[PDB]
Amino acid sequence: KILHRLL
Amino acid sequence: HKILHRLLQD
Amino acid sequence: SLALSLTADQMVSALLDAEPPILYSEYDPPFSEASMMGLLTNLADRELVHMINWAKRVPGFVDLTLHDQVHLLECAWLEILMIGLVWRSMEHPGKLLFAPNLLLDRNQGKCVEGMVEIFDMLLATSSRFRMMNLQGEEFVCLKSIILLNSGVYTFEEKDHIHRVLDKITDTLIHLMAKAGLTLQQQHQRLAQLLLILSHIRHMSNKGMEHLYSMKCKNVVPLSDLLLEMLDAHR
Amino acid sequence: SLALSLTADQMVSALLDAEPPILYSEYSEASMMGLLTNLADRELVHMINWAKRVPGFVDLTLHDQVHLLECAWLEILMIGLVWRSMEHPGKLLFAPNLLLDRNQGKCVEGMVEIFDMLLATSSRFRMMNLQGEEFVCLKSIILLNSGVEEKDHIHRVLDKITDTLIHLMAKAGLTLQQQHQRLAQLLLILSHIRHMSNKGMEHLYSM
Ligand SMILES: O=S(=O)(Oc1cccc(F)c1)[C@@H]1C[C@@H]2O[C@H]1C(c1ccc(OCCN3CCCCC3)cc1)=C2c1ccc(O)cc1
Numbered sequence: 001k002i003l004h005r006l007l
Numbered sequence: 008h009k010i011l012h013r014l015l016q017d
Numbered sequence: 018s019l020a021l022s023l024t025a026d027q028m029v030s031a032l033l034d035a036e037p038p039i040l041y042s043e044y045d046p047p048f049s050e051a052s053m054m055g056l057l058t059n060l061a062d063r064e065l066v067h068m069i070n071w072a073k074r075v076p077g078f079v080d081l082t083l084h085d086q087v088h089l090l091e092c093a094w095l096e097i098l099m100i101g102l103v104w105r106s107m108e109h110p111g112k113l114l115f116a117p118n119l120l121l122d123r124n125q126g127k128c129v130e131g132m133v134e135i136f137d138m139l140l141a142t143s144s145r146f147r148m149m150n151l152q153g154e155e156f157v158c159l160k161s162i163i164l165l166n167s168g169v170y171t172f173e174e175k176d177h178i179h180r181v182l183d184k185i186t187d188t189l190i191h192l193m194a195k196a197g198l199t200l201q202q203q204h205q206r207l208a209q210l211l212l213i214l215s216h217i218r219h220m221s222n223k224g225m226e227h228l229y230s231m232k233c234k235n236v237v238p239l240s241d242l243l244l245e246m247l248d249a250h251r
Numbered sequence: 252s253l254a255l256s257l258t259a260d261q262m263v264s265a266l267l268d269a270e271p272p273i274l275y276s277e278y279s280e281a282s283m284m285g286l287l288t289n290l291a292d293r294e295l296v297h298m299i300n301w302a303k304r305v306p307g308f309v310d311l312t313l314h315d316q317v318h319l320l321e322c323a324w325l326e327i328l329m330i331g332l333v334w335r336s337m338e339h340p341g342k343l344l345f346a347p348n349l350l351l352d353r354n355q356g357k358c359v360e361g362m363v364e365i366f367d368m369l370l371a372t373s374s375r376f377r378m379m380n381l382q383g384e385e386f387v388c389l390k391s392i393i394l395l396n397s398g399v400e401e402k403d404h405i406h407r408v409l410d411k412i413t414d415t416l417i418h419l420m421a422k423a424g425l426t427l428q429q430q431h432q433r434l435a436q437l438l439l440i441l442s443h444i445r446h447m448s449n450k451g452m453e454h455l456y457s458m
């Protein structure tokens with residue numbers, strides 16, 4: 001997910 | 008009214 | 018103002034004495050989605066009547082107006098059913114004790130669409146109470162806090178409810194100190210118990226969504242009381 | 252494990268330093284939802300970087316970090332909105348240039364009920380005179396609690412934040428009974444914040 005990429 | 012209304016009075 | 022003049026030991030005794038009984042379901046000895054939801058809604062309906070009697074025995078609840086009593090119970094009724102279910106399921110790992118003759122595991126929760134998600138959250142809360150070794154005196158304090166707190170933000174009368182809530186806070190700390198917890202352990206455990214109440218609110222709201230979908234799909238006939246308690250959240 | 256060894260005052264300054272900025276909005280049922288959506292999206296980027304600075308968060312696996320932010324993001328946005336709306340009774344300060352009142356929450360169906368709950372939370376914080384040091388503790392509790400070896404470490408950090416809240420209240424001169432009562436009052440508001448997020452997530456699902 002994008003949340004995964006931002007982390 | 009309401010059933011809860013009635014039950015609280017009873 | 019006679020609730021505010023209770024000692025901590027008198028608060029506990031009054032709450033323990035007000036406890037409702039454990040009811041039975043009318044179990045059928047095959048499970049369909051409809052037959053299981055019917056057992057649970059029938060049980061929840063009969064428990065709601067006893068909950069109303071219990072609420073009138075919570076110190077300070079009598080002092081509120083009839084309109085304020087309705088609002089608090091309308092807001093918290095499913096949280097209150099759930100914390101009671103989680104409490105009596107503590108000694109049954111991996112199982113939920115809806116009734117002494119209705120003890121189900123998560124694979125039986127799969128009978129109802131969307132039920133197993135709530136089932137897993139209730140089992141998780143039960144094991145959390147078990148790891149914390151939650152006491153019956155602490156349970157009845159937490160259940161009364163739900164009653165007075167959950168609807169207090171969506172209302173002078175507010176000040177009275179918060180004074181009673183503070184008294185239950187005093188009572189919880191008193192129980193933890195009498196149990197031998199250190200002063201630092203007291204506020205740490207108080208925080209742990211109160212943060213669980215946010216999970217119970219979460220489960221209640223997911224459970225209200227599920228009950229609303231069961232009604233809107235004609236899975237089971239809800240009682241008029243249950244229909245009114247559900248309508249208050251819609 | 253430099254999260255359990257922090258002092259109470261170090262926890263406060265660390266959380267205060269990690270505070271995200273106050274963003275501006277690019278300012279019908281579609282126009283207002285567009286501004287709130289655009290605002291929340293930009294806030295989320297800062298929230299993820301703020302979360303990485305909450306002591307004990309980076310010690311978790313990336314999977315647990317994702318799960319905590321997935322569960323808590325709307326609660327964190329809401330307590331942020333409630334906090335900066337404290338000094339604006341009856342108004343919600345979504346942004347310095349976007350100060351909305353209750354009536355402007357009727358443009359979107361079902362929005363006004365949540366507007367009322369947020370305003371009631373702001374009034375509650377205002378009546379408690381919630382301090383900024385307390386606010387950042389509560390927001391870190393929401394992050395760590397709303398999705399909770401690994402579970403024990405999360406509860407260890409949560410106990411440290413509890414110790415920090417009690418430390419702030421003892422520093423303010425509250426008696427032992429007042430510290431416990433105020434601690435309970437603050438944490439019970441999180442139950443209402445959870446309720447508002449649950450409701451808002453239901454309506455945001457309706458897209
Ligand atoms: O949800 S509500 O409580 O309000 C309502 C009520 C009824 C109907 C509604 F539609 C909204 C909610 C409270 C307040 O008003 C709504 C809202 C919001 C939040 C996120 C949104 O979009 C996220 C989408 N993203 C893109 C994809 C990535 C994830 C994020 C859109 C709106 C609010 C909000 C926004 C920013 C804040 O600092 C604080 C609060």
Ligand SMILES: Cn1c(N)nc2cc(-c3ccccc3)cnc21
Nearest residue numbers: 057060061098099102224227228
């Ligand atoms: C609609 N619904 C769902 N989905 N789970 C429930 C669970 C109960 C329950 C019954 C007895 C004791 C505790 C909870 C009641 N209704 C429920």
